[PDB]
Design a protein around this ligand. Structure first.
Ligand code: NI
Length: 94
């Protein structure tokens, strides 16, 4: 994956449909991990809760559906590659 190159700022606007996705607040509330605003990669306890929550799978797939680019999303001191995150999530649960 791309580990250095930053996303264009428009990458944030690509995330807009998640605000109309009911899986968003279910996953965030259940796990404590936030996509909006981005908290970055899940912490270990977060990931454990996400992997046991159906709606988190739904959300991650929803994010996949947005065609995230292979770049680093920067939000203050938060840095993550969303494309990497969503692609590696399911195996990360196993
Ligand atoms: Ni790489």
């Amino acid at each position: 994956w791309e580990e250095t190159k930053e996303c264009a700022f428009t990458e944030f606007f690509k995330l807009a449909p998640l605000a109309s996705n009911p899986a968003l607040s279910v996953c965030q509330d259940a796990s404590g991990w936030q996509m909006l605003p981005p908290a970055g990669y899940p912490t270990p306890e977060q990931l454990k809760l996400m992997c046991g929550t159906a709606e988190c799978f739904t959300l991650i797939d929803a994010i996949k559906a947005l065609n995230p680019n292979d770049c680093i999303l920067v939000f203050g001191d938060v840095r993550l590659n969303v494309k990497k995150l969503v692609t590696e999530f399911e195996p990360s649960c196993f």
